[PDB]
Amino acid sequence: LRKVVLDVELGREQVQLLYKPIYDSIADSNL
Amino acid sequence: MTFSSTSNLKELLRKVVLDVELGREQVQLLYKPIYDSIADSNL
């Protein structure tokens, strides 16, 4: 018979960059 | 002469029935907001 999969919601949660409002970014490859 | 004499002869008297509005209450589907439908005719 036909095979059907229960399309359930799994997978690890996405992670967000929460630090940005605090730190003052300094970007330079010369450091 | 008395109406009580002819009371039993129901076929002579006008038949009137008072409306009652009797029946069965409609049954709504309350579960719809909670569930996610998966309609497939070959499950």
UniProtKB/TrEMBL annotation, chain B:
This is Uncharacterized protein. It comes from Clostridioides difficile (Peptoclostridium difficile). The chain holds residues 57 to 99 of 345 of the full protein.
